[PDB]
Amino acid sequence: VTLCSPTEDDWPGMFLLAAASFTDFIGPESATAWRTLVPTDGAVVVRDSEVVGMALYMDLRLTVPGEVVLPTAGLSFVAVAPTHRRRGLLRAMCAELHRRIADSGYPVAALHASEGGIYGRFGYGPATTLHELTVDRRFARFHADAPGGSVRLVRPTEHRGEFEAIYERWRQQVPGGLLRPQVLWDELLAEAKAAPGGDRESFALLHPDGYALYRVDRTDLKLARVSELRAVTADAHCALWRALIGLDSMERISIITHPQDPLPHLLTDTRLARTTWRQDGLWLRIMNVPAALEARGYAHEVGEFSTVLEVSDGGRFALKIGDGRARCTPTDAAAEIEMDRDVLGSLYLGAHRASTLAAANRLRTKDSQLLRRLDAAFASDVPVQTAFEF
Amino acid sequence: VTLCSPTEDDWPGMFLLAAASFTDFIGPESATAWRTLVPTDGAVVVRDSEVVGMALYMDLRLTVPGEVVLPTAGLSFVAVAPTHRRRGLLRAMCAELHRRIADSGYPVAALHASEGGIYGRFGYGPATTLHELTVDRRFARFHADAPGGSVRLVRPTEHRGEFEAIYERWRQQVPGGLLRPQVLWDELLAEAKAAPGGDRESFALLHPDGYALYRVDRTDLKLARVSELRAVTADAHCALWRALIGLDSMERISIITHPQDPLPHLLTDTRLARTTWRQDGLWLRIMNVPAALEARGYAHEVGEFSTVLEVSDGGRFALKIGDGRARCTPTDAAAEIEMDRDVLGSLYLGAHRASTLAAANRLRTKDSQLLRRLDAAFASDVPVQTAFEF
Amino acid sequence: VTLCSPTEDDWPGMFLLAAASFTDFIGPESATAWRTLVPTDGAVVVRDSEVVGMALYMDLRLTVPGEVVLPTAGLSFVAVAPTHRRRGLLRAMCAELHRRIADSGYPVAALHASEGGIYGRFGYGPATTLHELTVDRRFARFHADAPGGSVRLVRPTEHRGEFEAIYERWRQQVPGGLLRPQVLWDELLAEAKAAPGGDRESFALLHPDGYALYRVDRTDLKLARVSELRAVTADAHCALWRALIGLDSMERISIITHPQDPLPHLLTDTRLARTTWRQDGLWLRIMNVPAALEARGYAHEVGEFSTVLEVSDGGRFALKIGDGRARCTPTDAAAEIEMDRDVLGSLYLGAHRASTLAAANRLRTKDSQLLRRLDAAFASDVPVQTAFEF
Amino acid sequence: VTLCSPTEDDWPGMFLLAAASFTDFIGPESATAWRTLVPTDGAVVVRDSEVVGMALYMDLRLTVPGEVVLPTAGLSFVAVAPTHRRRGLLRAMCAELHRRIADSGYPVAALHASEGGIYGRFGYGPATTLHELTVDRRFARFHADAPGGSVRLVRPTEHRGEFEAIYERWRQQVPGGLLRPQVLWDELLAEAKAAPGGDRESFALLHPDGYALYRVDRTDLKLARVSELRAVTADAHCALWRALIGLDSMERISIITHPQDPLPHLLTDTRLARTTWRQDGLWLRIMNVPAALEARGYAHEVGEFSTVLEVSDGGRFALKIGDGRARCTPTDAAAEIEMDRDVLGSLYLGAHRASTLAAANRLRTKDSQLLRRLDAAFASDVPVQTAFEF
Ligand SMILES: CCN(CC)CCC[C@@H](C)Nc1ccnc2cc(Cl)ccc12
Ligand SMILES: CCN(CC)CCC[C@@H](C)Nc1ccnc2cc(Cl)ccc12
Ligand SMILES: CCN(CC)CCC[C@@H](C)Nc1ccnc2cc(Cl)ccc12
């Protein structure tokens, strides 16, 4: 049992483990676009001879509060063979990639978790919240205050340029935003066409400042699933939902969105936009505590304050926050706040309140005023959204 | 079609309309406890002769941010006969009760809505959020950080005094908290016993600083439903959930809680606490804008600011917020913020952000800095919860 | 945390823990009949003051192969409070009752398990198999060979004497048979009547040599559930099933029976008797290995053989089996067969083959001929059935 | 309406009737491999001109107790047109094939039945039992006694040689085992690949002494279906199940196995391996009573005995069984045992006990000692399994 960077000769064994581990994984052609994002030395394999474990990271760009874009190591393609469970393979692979990621100078790593109980112990905290809304569009009426009482129905492949430009504006202005490389647009637009005994055709609704990609469900022919709605203005968001609610042959429109989606408030009956599912989205491991805390912007409303933050096995820092900026310097002064690394990841994009984590003892301080100040400072003006799964 | 305060001779016709309108309504004995809370002139009936419409309010005490307790008119028992729809009965009954409530000096009215599209147009905004969590307790393990790694299993009727004292502490410290009168404790403890072909027996878990009332579901014998968990400390909340997760004969524990319930963070897998349902809880109509805005406490973190707020048909006010206090005085100066009355009710307990309502055009300003300041100021340190339905 | 025999003052706390632990437990009146079977010193309670754990045994008579009746300690009413999990309460209660049971001279203990993963580690093996058959009686035709091509439809309470006499003959001739005391007949016949919003009335089919007790399902009005069919002859079994298949208003007849129920072979289509559920029934802990192995009869077909059997922490014995009898004497000679105590319980009534347990390594020998001889000898001529849950 | 051996010109009409009769039947390419197993004169067709009935047999090799391999006529492709029901076509086709099978010298015929009420009257008895186990693998823990606390994840098409060799060892040592010809391995490995809008890819787990072929369900993405597990040793069976329980992305693993599968005993909770389905597997018609009874081996444990067996319209025989061998000679001496031919088929591989068939009057004797001796003698040391459907 050795742990190495894979050679081109390892990739067939990796694709077998992938096919057997990931139901969404069609075959090698799938991985081609994503592999362009994996740097030299971005991958590890465990050999027993055959591949019994693998893991890699991709080079991503993640938007954080203050419209700051961080280089981000996106962990993916993580699998242990069913023959080799409880042998410490995941721990050994995560330790090696984290060493490489930290040495390469990434301030943060990120992943999407297949289960919620695995990645906490390696320092990852859930940092965005997926919120599925299902609208019974047969009853949906727009409120007198709703704007637009400008959208075209189009084939996605015919308007690639406009989708790319709208998404680029959205990903730079929204925390959780990720740069989407041309190879991932190629993939996305390939999935837009109908598959024999698979998905139905995707259509687009296109506004100058937003787009919605949607397709009728395979089996439930009265359900339209919105795969992605990117709106740069409130006017575009409202205009796009007026068009979706105009899908008169549908009973129901579902979307995976974020907890602060204003959709319900656009309707005379807010209860029509039902939360049908909630789950952790992006997970974040802070690799360098001071680089990460200094990089993000903070709420201007909270006045200047100083404290001492200890991350369990991640350092102790003098943290001063004022005028929307943090300074985070080494100290041996007594800790006023303590938390595990994963908790910091959960606070970092504003998706979870320090007060909530404190009430579960995840965050530890003896100062309730300091807790209120942390809550306010780490809050994000622009609500955190989830870009695309990787 | 006349609209009057009911005489004792009207109540049999009101109980018939009630039985036909409310599936939860067993008979006159139900209403007895609640009727002790209805003041003289708290009720209206429409006669065609028989009762075709009714509505009333109860005298309540509602906790708002800053631990301030407001006298509150609780609208309830609202029904129009199925013979008399689209005759303006609800509008006429709500106009009359609102006149009486305002003249009596109540700063706020509140209700629980049977549908989400009715009460907005009469000035009520959804002000609390019901959040059902279902835990698959067979997988639930507590996180190493969770406290208490002190609770007794008891019969509710044998510990009335301790439940009453715990709830009284909780309702004074939590926004959304409602005073519970002795007659409603009588009702609650009567519903605790098993019913022939109805609910199963309720049990209690009792801690010095919290209690949980729960009962196995009628038909799903592997589901325990927590009807009410009131915890005054984080230690009590955690200790009570350790005991609920100890119900080894159950697969699932469900509770109707609030969006900031720390339960998920107590577990090694946060995904185990699944959101299975979300809905508006308490609705709030601000009756007197200046009395209500001056009564509640505000976030100390936001520095002093002044603006001019117009409520559509509710006045225009110079609003100055600093040191956690508001002053709200008449002005004819130009409005910087405009919103309908219902929107103010939705902001008032901190359950909805001004920014979210602004993005749906419900709240209207041309100043993004003022929006951030309103969001921060109206936010509640202690998360808003829902007391009990009325 | 003390462990004691309960006084009459402990029983209210035991009934609270019972109500909270067992959904089938109506109240103290339930336990009255069963409590007549609990000997002095048959019960233990753990006090923290309130009852946080309890367990007891009843005096039973269990039929084993060879029509031999053993005094049997029936463990029941076992519960640990949800407040007191992972404190070793079950282990401490089982250790104390086992000490008392062994000292009192019981050769075997027995229980029905609420979960399949608990009792193995205390030496209990599953010893009978519950097998639910559902017949689509609309297609059921009897085979030309089936007997009876003599039964009365009766009210159970009017023929108590005849049911008692038939059951007494059946329980003495069938391994798994249990003596049913008059107080359990009182209970059974009380459950025969309809309950408001509960079970429907039970009817009986009565033959001189068998009876079937059945009732239409609460909600599925086309399903008849046979709660108990006791047939002393093949003619009675066939005659009773002809009558059940005559329930022309039903679609389906279900029964919880044993794997060798001949019902399917009575039909022209054996597939009509569908196995819809299977589960462990009675569990058996052999308390005294030599007393138990010498008491039961063995297959006459297998010729005399001798071996040395070791039970893990239960002794090593020279075991000689011939002419349907075993002699089982102390030895320090080398073990030819080894197994944990629970495995012996699983073999004891003939429900599980030594060969099957050997293939999972539960039973360990290096002699395949000895395995075939054990399989044959422990096999039961009369198939093992399950009497009634306790 | 004539009954003939088909010419090559009949096969298009046979493929039409096949397509209309068998949902599993894709087209002529399906039948190609199976047709290599049909001897000259192995097929009959009824013509009205078009094909309204067909039936054929394949040359098979079936393993019976004692590791004896019998030439076996496998009936298959049996269909009557929906236009021609109740015209005696099936009876006429079965009479003709049985004449040919008996004259060709086959001692037994076998089939898989589409319904359970058809083939009894033509002398076929159900001889193996299909037993579906579904494991909730999220709770599955191996017992301390389980072996292996050696398997590779592989693509089936890349290890054909090893699967062929393992299966050949398994089919010779297991009653119910069938020789699998190269053309059926070609078919099997063709079905291993994914189909557009059909089955997902199959994977293999490969041990030196066993293999498991499995694939994720089409629609239930948390269910893995084991299509075939062939283990020549207990160590291989346990090692393969450790790997299947390592499919961490699955909730449930299902397999169609046999009633004596030791899997449940490998787990700390035997109840986790739930029986979700049971059905007759292989059916057997004894064509030559003396050839069949003399060919199979018998239990060595039962001492020498002699009896006289009558098969209804199948002869009367002096049957002497001792030292694991039978001698079966013509007699006119009085019958001590009588049964229809189908009953003998059901006894022949040890899947059904003589005592069980006797209790339904299918087997008739006045000697209970003779019944015990038949039960013991016909029992199979190695439990009967089902090879592959034909
Ligand atoms: C956990 C399930 N998986 C892994 C295949 C899908 C995750 C989401 C999708 C868009 N990501 C992917 C889909 C397909 N191939 C890929 C190859 C690499 Cl290297 C990385 C990510 C990939
Ligand atoms: C909309 C459905 N309803 C009205 C009966 C139940 C609402 C919640 C319950 C606890 N409230 C009530 C239940 C029963 N009776 C009552 C009598 C009056 Cl005056 C007021 C409230 C009541
Ligand atoms: C595990 C679920 N339980 C325990 C109450 C029911 C088991 C089957 C039933 C017939 N047994 C019982 C039912 C009711 N009360 C009883 C009191 C005693 Cl001491 C013992 C057994 C009892």
Ligand SMILES: CCN(CC)CCC[C@@H](C)Nc1ccnc2cc(Cl)ccc12
């Ligand atoms: C009753 C349903 N059927 C008959 C097609 C499928 C039975 C099982 C499968 C593996 N057997 C078969 C599948 C496909 N074609 C075949 C052609 C012949 Cl001659 C015999 C058997 C065949």
